[PDB]
Amino acid sequence: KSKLAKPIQDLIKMIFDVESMKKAMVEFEIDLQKMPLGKLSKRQIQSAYSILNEVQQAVSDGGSESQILDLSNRFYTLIPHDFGMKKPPLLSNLEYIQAKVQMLDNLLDIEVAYSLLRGGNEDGDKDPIDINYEKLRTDIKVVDKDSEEAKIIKQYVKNTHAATHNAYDLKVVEIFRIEREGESQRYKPFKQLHNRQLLWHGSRTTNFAGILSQGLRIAPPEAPVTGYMFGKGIYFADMVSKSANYCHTSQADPIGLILLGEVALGNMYELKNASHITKLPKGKHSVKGLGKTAPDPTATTTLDGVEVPLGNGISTGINDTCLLYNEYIVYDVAQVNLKYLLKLKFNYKT
Ligand SMILES: COc1cccc(-c2nc3c(C(N)=O)cccc3[nH]2)c1
């Protein structure tokens, strides 16, 4: 059958799980009877973003109440929703509009996964697992448990778990070394920058076929800048628990996936409060939201010339900021080089 190693086989199955894709859409309150997985279109999603962009403008700029109603009706007609025996809420407040922009970010990845899964299964000689694997265009290898890399990664997970994020425990089930096709070449010029760190990136399991085949992506130009704190960029953290919260796991579904990527930060543009940034000031390569807590600088190590902030959660002293923990944002897709994929087990405490 499958030529792949057991853990990789189980990773592929989890990634392309159809039931999970539907569960995600249901959580987003989408009407699966009026809009099944097969109906999802790229241009459909793209248009929904532009509708959200306009309605966001109308609300913030004091638009006519009739325009907001019109935009609301157009949005729900485009993407059928199921609100029960409840009245459909209008897209009239920035927080609901924000929630909808994020639904679209996820649908963009779900659509990719379903499209990959659906076509190209014309072999027979090759096992279905192998075929889907090749669709990812990503070389995946299991990292040795009693390795030096693994030891360093486990230390990073254990030491960087946030204090306020103790609604669960975390166990590293498997660590995979991943290499997306052509990504190392895309990232090559940034090897010239200083301050290259190994940072975390959490996401729903349903987003991984898109992340692996397309890479980490920045929100589309049609998207409202408002739906993203520090503008439209790629977000990372130095505390495993801050990113792990973005996996959206539960006690009924405790297995999450998280990435470790080498990110070329260079000279950081340090911010204490949110800012819908459009472009970097001269001499800046990234943004750094300052948090009240961050890893112990004395404990910072190296893994292939890349800094690994694995020290224990220490008080930064920059205790006059909005953020409780740091945030790292890059506005160039080529400034990131994915290295590891970890399969985590969230042990929700009672
Ligand atoms: C889920 O949609 C959004 C929208 C805006 C910002 C974000 C957002 N994601 C992260 C992550 C991460 N994903 O690992 C880490 C640190 C800060 C972050 N902010 C997510």
Q: What angle do CA 239, 289, 245 make, to 5 degrees?
A: 35
State the virtual CA torsion across 8, 36, 54, 323 in degrees, nearest 10. Answer: -40
Whichever domain contains 319, its CATH number is 3.90.228.10
User: What is the distance between the alpha carbons of residues 255 and 257, in angstroms, rounded to a whole number?
Assistant: 7
Contact indicator for 325, 306 with CB cutoff of 8 Å: no
Instruction: Answer whether 145's CB lies under 8 Å from 171's CB.
Output: no
Amino acid at 36: P
Q: How far is Cα 222 from Cα 174, in angstroms, rounded to an integer?
A: 37
Alpha-carbon torsion, ordered 20, 98, 345, 181, to 10 deg: 70
Q: With contact defined as beta carbons under 8 Å apart, do 275 and 323 qualify?
A: no
> Residue 253 has which token pair?
């579904």
Structure tokens, 304: 């292939």
d(C-alpha 67, C-alpha 60), whole Å: 13
**3-state secondary structure (DSSP) of residue 301:** strand
Q: Give the number of domains in the chain.
A: 2
User: Are residues 281 and 191 both part of a single domain?
Assistant: yes
Ligand 1 midpoint to CA 316 (Å) = 21
Q: What are the catalytic residues? A: 327
Q: In whole angstroms, give the CA distance from residue 50 to residue 221.
A: 9
Closest Cα to atom 8 of ligand 1: 235
**Lookup: tokens for 192:** 């010239």
- Separation in Å, CA 166 to CA 28, 49, 169, 170, 237: 26, 35, 7, 10, 17
DSSP-derived 3-state class of residue 125? coil
Report how far residue 269's alpha carbon sits from residue 283's, in angstroms, rounded to the nearest whole number. Answer: 9
- Ligand 1 centroid distance, CA of 219 (Å): 12
- How many angstroms does the Cα of residue 235 sit away from the middle of ligand 1? 5
Does 159 share its domain with 284? Answer: yes
Residue 40 CA to residue 113 CA, distance in Å, equals 11
Query: Between helices 128-135 and 6-15, what is the axis angle to 10°?
Result: 70
Polymer length in residues for the chain: 350
Helix (H, G, I), strand (E, B) or coil at 327: strand
Token digits for 311?
């020290």
249 shares its domain with 174: yes
**Residue 56 · residue 97 · CB < 8 Å:** yes
For the record, the structure tokens of 106 come out as 């996820």
Same domain assignment for residues 47 and 153 = no
CA dist 137 and 210 (Å) reads 11
Measured from the Cα of 246, ligand 1's closest atom is 13
Q: Is the dihedral of CA 57, 59, 61, 66 positive or negative?
A: positive
Spatial distance between the Cα atoms of 97 and 90, rounded to a whole number of angstroms: 9
Q: Angle of helix 94-118 relative to helix 42-60, nearest 10 degrees?
A: 170
306 and 335 share one domain: yes
Q: How far is it, in rounded angstroms, from Cα 110 to Cα 222?
A: 19
CA distance 8 to 152: 21
CA-to-CA separations, 43 to 206, 210, 227, 307, 335, in angstroms, rounded: 20, 16, 20, 40, 27
Mark whether 51 and 182 lie in a shared domain.
no
Q: Kindly list the protein residues whose Cβ atom lies closer than 6 A to any atom of ligand 1.
A: 102, 105, 200-203, 228-229, 235-237, 242-243, 246, 327
Beta carbons of 210 and 113 less than 8 angstroms apart: yes
Percentages (nearest 5) of helix, strand, coil residues in the chain: 40, 25, 35
Measured from the CA of 105, which atom of ligand 1 is nearest? 2
d(CA 140, CA 8): 7
Measured distance CA(221)–CA(232) in Å, rounded: 9
- Residue pair 91/53 in contact (Cβ under 8 Å)? The answer is no
Resolution of the PDB structure in angstroms: 2.2
Distance between CA atoms of 194 and 267, rounded to whole angstroms? 8
Task: Tell me the C-alpha distance between 159 and 139, whole Å.
Answer: 29
Residues 280 and 344 in one domain: yes
Q: Which among 119, 136, 153 is the end of a domain?
A: 136
Cβ pair 35, 45 in contact under 8 A: no
Element housing 337 (H / E)? strand 336-348
Q: Last residue of a domain, which of 120, 136, 152?
A: 136
Co-location of 96 and 245 in the same domain = no
Burial group, residue 165, by CB count within 10 angstroms (0-12, 13-18, 19+): middle
Q: What is the DSSP string of 52-114?
A: HHHHHHHHHTT--HHHHHHHHHHHHHHS-B---SSPPPPS-SHHHHHHHHHHHHHHHHHHHHH
Cβ-in-10-Å burial (0-12, 13-18, 19+) of 150 comes to middle
Do 196 and 296 belong to one domain? yes
What three-state secondary structure class fits 302?
strand
Which whole-number Å values give the CA distances from 180 to 43, 72, 207, 305, 334, in the listed order?
A: 26, 39, 15, 20, 12
Cβ proximity of 264 and 196 under 8 Å: yes
**Beta strand 286-289 pairing with 327-330:** antiparallel
Continuous segment of H or E residues that includes residue 268: strand 268-271
The tokens 């996936």 sit on which residue? 257
Torsion of CA 273, 274, 276, 277, to 10 degrees: 40
Classified as helix, coil or strand, 224 is: coil
Nearest to 165 by CA among 39, 324, 314, 38: 324
Tracing tokens 């649908």 back to the chain, one arrives at 107
What CATH number is attached to the domain comprising 7?
A: 1.20.142.10
Please give the full DSSP string across 242-267, using - where no structure is assigned.
HHHGGG---SSS-EEEEEEEEEE--S
Look up the domain containing 2 and give its range.
1-136
**Cα Rg of the chain, angstroms:** 21
